Amino acid sequence: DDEETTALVCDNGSGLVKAGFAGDDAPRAVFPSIVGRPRHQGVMVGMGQKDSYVGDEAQSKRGILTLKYPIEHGIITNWDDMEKIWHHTFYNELRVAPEEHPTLLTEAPLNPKANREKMTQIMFETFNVPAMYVAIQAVLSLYASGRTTGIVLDSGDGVTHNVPIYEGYALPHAIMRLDLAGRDLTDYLMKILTERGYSFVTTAEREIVRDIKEKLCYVALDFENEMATAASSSSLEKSYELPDGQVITIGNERFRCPETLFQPSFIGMESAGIHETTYNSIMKCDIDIRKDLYANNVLSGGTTMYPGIADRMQKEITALAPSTMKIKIIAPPERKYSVWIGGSILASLSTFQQMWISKQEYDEAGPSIVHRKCF
Amino acid sequence: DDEETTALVCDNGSGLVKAGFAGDDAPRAVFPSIVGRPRHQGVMVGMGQKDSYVGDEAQSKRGILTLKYPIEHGIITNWDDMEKIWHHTFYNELRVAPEEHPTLLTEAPLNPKANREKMTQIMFETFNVPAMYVAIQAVLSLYASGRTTGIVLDSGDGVTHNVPIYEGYALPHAIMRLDLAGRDLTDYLMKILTERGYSFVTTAEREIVRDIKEKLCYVALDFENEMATAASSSSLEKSYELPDGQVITIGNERFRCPETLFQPSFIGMESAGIHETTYNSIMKCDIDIRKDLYANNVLSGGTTMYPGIADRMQKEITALAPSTMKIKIIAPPERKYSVWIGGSILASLSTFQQMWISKQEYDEAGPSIVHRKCF
Amino acid sequence: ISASRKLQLKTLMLQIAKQELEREAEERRGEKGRALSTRCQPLELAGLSFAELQDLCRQLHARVDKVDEERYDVEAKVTKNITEIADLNQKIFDLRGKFKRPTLRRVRISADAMMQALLGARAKET
Amino acid sequence: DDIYKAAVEQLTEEQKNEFKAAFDIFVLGAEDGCISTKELGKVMRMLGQNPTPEELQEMIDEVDEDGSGTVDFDEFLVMMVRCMKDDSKGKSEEELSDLFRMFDKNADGYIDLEELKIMLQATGETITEDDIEELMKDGDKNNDGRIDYDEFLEFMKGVE
Amino acid sequence: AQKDEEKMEIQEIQLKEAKHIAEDADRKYEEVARKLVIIESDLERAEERAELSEGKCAELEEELKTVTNNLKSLEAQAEKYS
Amino acid sequence: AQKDEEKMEIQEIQLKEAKHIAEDADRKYEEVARKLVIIESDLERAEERAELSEGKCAELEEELKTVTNNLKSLEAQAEKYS
Amino acid sequence: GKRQTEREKKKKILAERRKVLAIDHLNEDQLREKAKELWQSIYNLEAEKFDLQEKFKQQKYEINVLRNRINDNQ
Numbered sequence A, B: 001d002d003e004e005t006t007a008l009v010c011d012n013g014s015g016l017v018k019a020g021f022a023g024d025d026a027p028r029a030v031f032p033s034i035v036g037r038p039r040h041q042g043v044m045v046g047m048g049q050k051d052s053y054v055g056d057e058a059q060s061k062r063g064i065l066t067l068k069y070p071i072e073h074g075i076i077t078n079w080d081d082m083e084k085i086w087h088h089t090f091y092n093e094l095r096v097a098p099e100e101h102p103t104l105l106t107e108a109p110l111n112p113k114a115n116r117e118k119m120t121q122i123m124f125e126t127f128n129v130p131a132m133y134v135a136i137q138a139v140l141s142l143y144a145s146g147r148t149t150g151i152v153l154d155s156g157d158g159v160t161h162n163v164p165i166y167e168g169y170a171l172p173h174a175i176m177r178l179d180l181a182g183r184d185l186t187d188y189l190m191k192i193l194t195e196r197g198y199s200f201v202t203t204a205e206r207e208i209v210r211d212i213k214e215k216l217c218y219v220a221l222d223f224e225n226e227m228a229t230a231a232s233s234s235s236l237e238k239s240y241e242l243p244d245g246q247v248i249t250i251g252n253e254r255f256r257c258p259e260t261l262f263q264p265s266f267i268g269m270e271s272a273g274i275h276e277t278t279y280n281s282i283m284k285c286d287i288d289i290r291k292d293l294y295a296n297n298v299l300s301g302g303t304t305m306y307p308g309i310a311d312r313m314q315k316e317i318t319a320l321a322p323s324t325m326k327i328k329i330i331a332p333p334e335r336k337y338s339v340w341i342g343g344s345i346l347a348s349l350s351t352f353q354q355m356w357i358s359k360q361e362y363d364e365a366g367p368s369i370v371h372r373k374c375f
Numbered sequence C: 001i002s003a004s005r006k007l008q009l010k011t012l013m014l015q016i017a018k019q020e021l022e023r024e025a026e027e028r029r030g031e032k033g034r035a036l037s038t039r040c041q042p043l044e045l046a047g048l049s050f051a052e053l054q055d056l057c058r059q060l061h062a063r064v065d066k067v068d069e070e071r072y073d074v075e076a077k078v079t080k081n082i083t084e085i086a087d088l089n090q091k092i093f094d095l096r097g098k099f100k101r102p103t104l105r106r107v108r109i110s111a112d113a114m115m116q117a118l119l120g121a122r123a124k125e126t
Numbered sequence D: 001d002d003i004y005k006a007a008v009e010q011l012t013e014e015q016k017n018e019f020k021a022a023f024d025i026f027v028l029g030a031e032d033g034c035i036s037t038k039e040l041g042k043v044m045r046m047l048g049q050n051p052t053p054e055e056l057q058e059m060i061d062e063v064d065e066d067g068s069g070t071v072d073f074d075e076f077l078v079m080m081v082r083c084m085k086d087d088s089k090g091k092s093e094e095e096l097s098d099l100f101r102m103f104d105k106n107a108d109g110y111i112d113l114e115e116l117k118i119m120l121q122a123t124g125e126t127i128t129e130d131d132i133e134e135l136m137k138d139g140d141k142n143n144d145g146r147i148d149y150d151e152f153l154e155f156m157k158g159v160e
Numbered sequence E, F: 001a002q003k004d005e006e007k008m009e010i011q012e013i014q015l016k017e018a019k020h021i022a023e024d025a026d027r028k029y030e031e032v033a034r035k036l037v038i039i040e041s042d043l044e045r046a047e048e049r050a051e052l053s054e055g056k057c058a059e060l061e062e063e064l065k066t067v068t069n070n071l072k073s074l075e076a077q078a079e080k081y082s
Numbered sequence G: 001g002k003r004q005t006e007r008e009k010k011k012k013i014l015a016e017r018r019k020v021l022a023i024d025h026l027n028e029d030q031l032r033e034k035a036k037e038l039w040q041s042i043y044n045l046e047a048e049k050f051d052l053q054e055k056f057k058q059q060k061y062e063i064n065v066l067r068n069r070i071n072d073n074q
């Protein structure tokens, strides 16, 4: 590289911040988005103890911290912590001053306006970027698949949203946003582990339960048969070693944790599972583009990485859909970073180079410029 | 040396007072903390007989004195005698007036407040020091090892306490203080020696029993095998010459005296040994710092100098702990003075130079200043 | 080479470095004074009509405004840089600190005192 | 350790003869006609100092290079001047940090041997390229061909 | 004779000190030897674990290659059927 | 005088015995300590090797599991396609 | 908000520096005095700016050293 100017494709997310320069294949730095103040007193003098460890540093000292995510469900609830996370991302994980780089944030659909306006105001006043643009997290995941149609189910860690798109024309009346995501699955797993004796309570042990969920849980192809099998044999019980020994054995908690996605009544949510909100999102579309959406169903986001979900979802939709249509579920192996790869592709386009919100435009219309033509 | 001002690192302890200027390797003057008034009548006139011999002088005239320690279990029970000991330490063993030197006392964890407040009031009113600071006896022993984590078992002569520390953040809810220490082992040895015919009763002969304990006793790697071996062969019987002749032969009393540490039921104490209170102190800590505490177990204090204790303790903890963790026991050769070396290091730090309790601060808030921010 | 020569070279290089540092610092000070004096020129407008005087007053007001804005922005940037520097310094100290505690020894008594103590009566000069 | 060699190196044969007479005074009648680390420990105990044997090992190993456990004439002088540590406090670390910052005129984070040459020419002492090569071998721990700042501290550690 | 007695007392004190020092050094030596025994045993166990894990890793590599080939074959079959 | 001479002679004999025993203990301790340090280095190398091998084995197991799941899915789909 | 807090704080400091130019009613000598005072203030600010520049260059080199040592801490 050299002259010229590259764009910063940041992607706030909720659970893992993924960032990197535009035009690559994978994000340069991926690290949890947690800011944890120490909670004990501290007796050693001169140890160089800081007041807040952010990012991946607080996943190593988590034994004496109180980690707290600054993004609850897509929306940002603690602006100071989010500013700290952004500052860390720019200066220590990429080491590029923001004064010389455009930024491309990402935002979930149907989010509060004030969140987006505050985001752009921060990026323009504190970090003082040249130009920033905010994009919907599902269109990027559709970019990365190399398609131009299809209905994308982006089940992140904060919020699961399902944006249908045809021929490049998004259908704003058919977006079905559901707030069940990876975090609720972690909490439900932590709640059903107590049925064997293992109690995880501290906010640090939520990370251990998350690791258990990632490494062991899988989505059952048929729920009742698995419940019957796990209750008779013992071929499912997989063991796992805690960060201090005392291995634990997970029985039928393995496929009961991610089953909450298809039956949100487990955690008390009323709505229908991710297998039926996709069909409802399709049926709201026009009658002539339903075949294409059926054939190009796209999966993205981290939580769709459970082993065996691309078959359960296809079976469910085939049960719901008319018998003639072909149901195909696109599940690329690079699912987790699909949104960021799409973001890189979009930022690398020449046609897109004039859509950025230039700073002089913000100076003339204020932060409310984001809702205007420069979307 | 010259200009400038050096700090006095005193360390009251219970059994041996260790003192010296900050910045050296070893304490300048180490002497027992006993004050013994004469008990007989005295007929020679003009012999220059004093009314109380303190320190190492009363270990040479102990034949006609009644030695009595002024510190029972960490706490101080006889304030006049303790003041006398401090006065001797400052004026005759170091020969530096306290009006021109900061002091750094040490105190066991979980001690009564009134003891600490009276200590600071004495140091500020009677000796009139410029500034004094009180530190927990285990953090210093952790300083001396050059670590910053680890769980330190400081088995002194008065009280055995077990303070776990991680990354410089002490865990106040996991301190396990047990009142079995070297003095109780001396009394138990003096009590089991009577099974062969040797009766030591006088408070002067307690010193002889202490010398026997120091020179002969050792900790058995396996207790039952040693009890069986000592009851068949005679390869263990080591003899020792009293201060007047009449050598004595110690049989299986050798490893039965220090075994009380791992089975406090011998002296009627209910609690568990020093091998199990360390494991309990670890298990109270968080689940993510248990590996580091397992790997950095530190020994300190005088009573941990028994030949063969660093192996017995490791065997016991390895039996208790999960099989995967590595158990390592740090036993530096300079164990006895570890607390004082750490105190010297702490007093020599530049970052610590503003933590002293300055005299004007005491004048404004009274002796209760010690519990405040200046801990 | 002999260790005495090496120590002499060490102290000589230290002195040379100190001399160069002081010389360059003084050079920087003199050049800074010259350049800054070049930047802002002294004025001479005594006895003029008060209209031009107040015009100059407003002009200098605005110039100070611009200069202060720039200087305060630079100061804020420098302070942020120093903050990052301190944070990185502490982080690096944490990463590879531990047993790097400096030590001092005083048990090494004066050699003449030790020889006198080992000798006794027959030690007067040696 | 070589620091004591440098310090004694300024002295002349008078100190050698003085220590010869001192050896006559102290080591007369010895079966070995020398001194060892165990011998030094025993004498110190008799003299009234009670150090740890680990320190005995630390001192003798720093001085016993040939494995004889003894003190060579030059090494005996170095040890006798080593017992008293006159050069304390090793100046100021921050001052040396600023000096080394001044050192990298190239401002590359590395030390160029050309600066070494200029500095030595400033010193003007009798030096060949071999002297500078030996000095670099002494200092350049990572063999980077420069003077690393940490290596700079080490080669100036305790150096007044 | 009295002066010779005093010298005898001095030699006795020296004997005491020498015996004490010899005992202490012997203690240090034997303790270090036993610790070396334990350390050698631990090192042996670590060698065994590392070698076994290396063998396991090689076998897993072979299984990976075979199952990868099977996956490629069934991919071709799937495309044909499509 | 006879008593004193006897005690002096026994003192000298015992003193020399003590000195030589102390020296032999020192030599043995030195040898054992050096061999102990060497064995410690060997143990550290064995431990790091074991860590490497276990990390590699974990990665291989994960890869094998993923490939096996993909194989099972493709097999079921091929049968249904026939 | 904290970003708004800082932005308003900078603006408030800026206004704080903004002394009231109320001098027309004064006389020629006093006007000269005020002008020279402002000239001296500018001189001081320039010196501060140059010091900031030199310290920033030193900061840059120090951060370079930090990155190098970080590389050394692999």
Ligand SMILES: Nc1ncnc2c1ncn2[C@@H]1O[C@H](COP(=O)(O)OP(=O)(O)O)[C@@H](O)[C@H]1O
Residues within 6 Å of the ligand: A012, A013, A014, A015, A016, A017, A155, A156, A157, A158, A182, A183, A186, A210, A213, A214, A215, A301, A302, A303, A305, A306, A336
């Ligand atoms: N391999 C995996 N298997 C199962 N769940 C995973 C896996 N990787 C990540 N997850 C879940 O997905 C979440 C990360 O989702 P991510 O896509 O990073 O969210 P975001 O959209 O905020 O970036 C984690 O919290 C975790 O619960």
Ligand SMILES: Nc1ncnc2c1ncn2[C@@H]1O[C@H](COP(=O)(O)OP(=O)(O)O)[C@@H](O)[C@H]1O
Residues within 6 Å of the ligand: B012, B013, B014, B015, B016, B017, B155, B156, B157, B158, B182, B183, B186, B210, B213, B214, B215, B301, B302, B303, B305, B306, B336
């Ligand atoms: N070499 C030794 N072997 C066995 N026990 C010892 C040894 N040295 C000291 N002790 C015991 O330790 C006690 C001294 O402990 P110390 O650490 O001085 O206590 P404090 O913490 O009050 O300073 C003595 O009473 C003695 O019983």
Ligand SMILES: [Ca+2]
Residues within 6 Å of the ligand: D063, D064, D065, D066, D067, D068, D069, D070, D071, D072, D075
């Ligand atoms: Ca030698």
Ligand SMILES: [Ca+2]
Residues within 6 Å of the ligand: D103, D104, D105, D106, D107, D108, D109, D110, D111, D112, D115
């Ligand atoms: Ca250079």
Ligand SMILES: [Ca+2]
Residues within 6 Å of the ligand: D139, D140, D141, D142, D143, D144, D145, D146, D147, D148, D151
């Ligand atoms: Ca180097």
Ligand SMILES: [Mg+2]
Residues within 6 Å of the ligand: A013, A014, A137, A154, A156, A157, A301, A302, A339
């Ligand atoms: Mg996402």
Ligand SMILES: [Mg+2]
Residues within 6 Å of the ligand: B013, B014, B137, B154, B156, B157, B301, B302, B339
């Ligand atoms: Mg103590």
